Paper text:
Because the S. mansoni genome does not codify an adenosine phosphorylase, one alternative to fulfilling this activity is 5´-deoxy-5´-methylthioadenosine phosphorylase (E.C. 2.4.2.28) (MTAP). This enzyme catalyzes the reversible phosphorolysis of 5´-deoxy-5´-methylthioadenosine (MTA) to free adenine and 5´-deoxy-5´-methythioribose-1-phosphate (MTR1P). The observed overall fold of SmMTAP is similar to that of members from NP-1 family of low-molecular weight purine nucleoside phosphorylases (PNP), which consist of a central β-sheet distorted barrel surrounded by α-helices, as observed in other MTAPs from human and bacteria. Furthermore, a comparison of the KM levels reveals that S. mansoni MTAP can use adenosine with the same efficiency as MTA, which is one fundamental difference between S. mansoni and its host and reveals a potential target for schistosomiasis drug development.
A complex between the SmMTAP mutant S12T and MTA was also obtained; in this case, MTA bound all subunits, causing gate loop closure in the A and B subunits, whereas subunit C was in open conformation. The adenine molecule or adenine moiety of MTA forms three H-bonds within residues D230 (2) and D232 (1) and one H-bond with a water molecule, which is anchored by the side chain of residues D232 and S118. For MTA in the S12T structure, only one H-bond is formed in RBS (MTA O2'—M206 N). The presence of the mutation S12T does not alter the phosphate loop compared to the SmMTAP WT structures. The main and side chains of T12 forms the same H-bonds with sulphate molecules observed in human MTAP.
Author numbering:
A (entry chain A): 3 to 235, 240 to 292
B (entry chain C): 3 to 235, 241 to 291
C (entry chain B): 3 to 291
The structure:
Amino acid sequence: KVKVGIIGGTGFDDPNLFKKVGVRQVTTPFGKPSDTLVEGFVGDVACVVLPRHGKGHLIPPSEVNYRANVWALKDLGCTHILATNACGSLQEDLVPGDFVVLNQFMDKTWGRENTFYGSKPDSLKGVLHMPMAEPFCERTRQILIQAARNKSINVYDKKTMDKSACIHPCVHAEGSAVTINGPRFSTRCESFIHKAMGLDIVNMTLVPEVSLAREAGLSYASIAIVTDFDCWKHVCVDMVLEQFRKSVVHVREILLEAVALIGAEDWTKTIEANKALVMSSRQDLL
Amino acid sequence: KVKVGIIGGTGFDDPNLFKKVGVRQVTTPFGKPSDTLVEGFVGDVACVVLPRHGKGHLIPPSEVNYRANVWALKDLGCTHILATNACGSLQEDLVPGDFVVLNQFMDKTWGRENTFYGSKPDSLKGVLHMPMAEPFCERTRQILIQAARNKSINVYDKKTMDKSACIHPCVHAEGSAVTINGPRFSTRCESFIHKAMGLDIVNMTLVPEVSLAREAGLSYASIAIVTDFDCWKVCVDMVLEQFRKSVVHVREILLEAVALIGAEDWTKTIEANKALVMSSRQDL
Amino acid sequence: KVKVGIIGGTGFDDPNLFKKVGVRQVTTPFGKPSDTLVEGFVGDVACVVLPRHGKGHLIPPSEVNYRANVWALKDLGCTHILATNACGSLQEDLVPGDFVVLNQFMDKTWGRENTFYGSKPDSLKGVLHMPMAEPFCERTRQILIQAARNKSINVYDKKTMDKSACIHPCVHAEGSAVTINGPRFSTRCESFIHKAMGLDIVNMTLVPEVSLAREAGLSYASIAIVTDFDCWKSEEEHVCVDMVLEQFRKSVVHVREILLEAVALIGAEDWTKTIEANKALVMSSRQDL
Ligand SMILES: CSC[C@H]1O[C@@H](n2cnc3c(N)ncnc32)[C@H](O)[C@@H]1O
Ligand SMILES: CSC[C@H]1O[C@@H](n2cnc3c(N)ncnc32)[C@H](O)[C@@H]1O
Ligand SMILES: CSC[C@H]1O[C@@H](n2cnc3c(N)ncnc32)[C@H](O)[C@@H]1O
């Protein structure tokens, strides 16, 4: 049976997705998650919410315990994780107030625990080399886009639609993220180099969250909230929080509809393949 | 009033900038600085100098306590930091013996403490997300450039001048650095990749020093010394003589830059520096 | 005079290279190596082999003690290190089953000890800034290439041969590697970005091994084994552990043949000046002295 975990980032401290049924404080083999987990239901579908940066946003991106957050949701029997991520746009048609259902990323983070497996005592025994060519669960990506359509939110696909058909605010049907380590924002030089590489948005939290989700055998998809233009075009904290304020109502609608849409389908084969993928990536056993 | 801290890179392990008035062996919340801080004056202007690599150049770039160095200067009441940074050139017009007053960078460092704030036990409490689009203090950059002019050094600005102004040796009035972790120098493949990205010089020490200075509310500017062509493109005695001549020039730039800083009002700039820190605290 | 160390990667967790003469259980000032080191002879040349990931391949690329592996081989008197490195191809002409005698790299690793020297108690006292423009030992590179020829394996030299002269499987006489930190494989986005930078292969273990060998005054060369296309070529078999191990199975005998012949070729030459130069480069790179 399906159970959807939700990891909320900047601006999503009041998800208001369901009346809470229960509240749970857990530990994992990798430490404590960012905060208490809040439990409830969307229809018949069990749902669990946690704030990535903890209540009060005291934890910076580089210090978030991504391993504990993902493993805590796995241990509650989540089959899916939906994530929100505030980001800066590197592209003219990705405008503050738009959303992006990411399908690609380039990793520029460092110093974070990015795998559950290793040779040290605070990791699980083994060597896990996971395929990441298409790093998200494509089924769950498409459910996020379909949820946007079902809630009458514009969807823009730059492959099949002229730029003049891009009506803001819109959900972009694809996009690539560069994940930088933070906590500072990029220089103009860095922003132009990321733009020249063809990346669409920049953010501090996607990785290693997406990677650990796949290690945990979970279907993961992110909805990126464009809160600013990165400085190739000026981003600051107050600018980001103000835009997320204007966009959070849509984030809620999409996530709410997405959970219901997940629950309406059979995931048996996908889940079995998620699990089999973890086992076939163990080099120490092969 | 103003007080200018100076962080001396390679070639400045024992700077003879001013008569030593006092010395300060301090400890910061983030550990010990690279060495004792030397206090004095340039005319009327208070000044503090420390060698980034310590006496004897025993501390490699990745192990320099950038947080302690910057915070120690802040605790002494510095309003500005001037820094020197030896570098390799990535471009044909940047020649050994030239200098660069950097205005941009691309960060390839890792494993260094690059922020004063966090939830970790060895940081101050808070989440600080600093804007860094133009990461230096532009007033202080122009002062280093003017100091070079005042000491009869050629200044070349490829935005406002044609190539005829690029007469060596010259101070390049803008430039972008890639900061690598070291300690090894780049491969030819790495050098060509950085060149293709349009970067001007490569160095090991600019970041996180520039980042932490802005976190500390301080105006910061770097004068980079071109010591070599990086290996995209040489007896040691000639290299050392040329570096020696470059150090004389940089010493003159720094002393003149301190006097230039002391001659202007910085009230509003300093208030803006501090306000940028406060408005960058997301946890508040 | 000469003694050749060998660091075996994937496919070499049990090297099986020569008759075991001595088994060394050692420690270094930087900790324990990945496994015991096996000493013996290839023909008349002394040789030492160790598995980079240890016997069970329980040590991931990010956690290998590169410093201890290299220093341990130095302490046993090695003058040379030959390394194998499994990799994915970023280029149409580098096909699974080919090998690459690397001559360049771009480093995207982090969090690994990459130098013997520093100011902390677990390093040697000093500051070493090594030049790395051409980061391999060129004589030892050419010996790997000659060893392929002596064993009737195709050699492809893009500088002197046309694209239609590339016959697979072949040893490529040059190539650039991007070293990523792992353990995950690259995304499609990352793979196309590395390809656009002109890199030839992607791998997780070359760096800092190559850098520390030069710091130790040793001649180092890597033979990269193309086990997959990296995921830019989606119309091919997508990279995974199982595919890598399967291709390595089909290639390992030829890798051993090149290694064993290269060891013999190294012993057949004089290295007095090259070793003196390796050592002098270390001393002239000390910036505390
Ligand atoms: C509160 S502003 C910083 C937070 O917003 C995100 N963010 C928004 N815009 C950007 C940007 N232009 N670059 C990087 N991260 C950004 C980051 O992931 C971070 O957690
Ligand atoms: C004492 S030599 C090492 C110093 O040289 C500087 N440097 C000079 N040239 C280069 C270069 N081409 N690449 C990197 N760093 C360099 C680095 O910042 C380092 O502190
Ligand atoms: C078992 S597959 C992963 C191992 O082989 C190497 N390898 C093979 N293919 C790749 C690839 N496409 N990218 C990165 N490393 C690879 C890595 O260095 C690692 O030790």
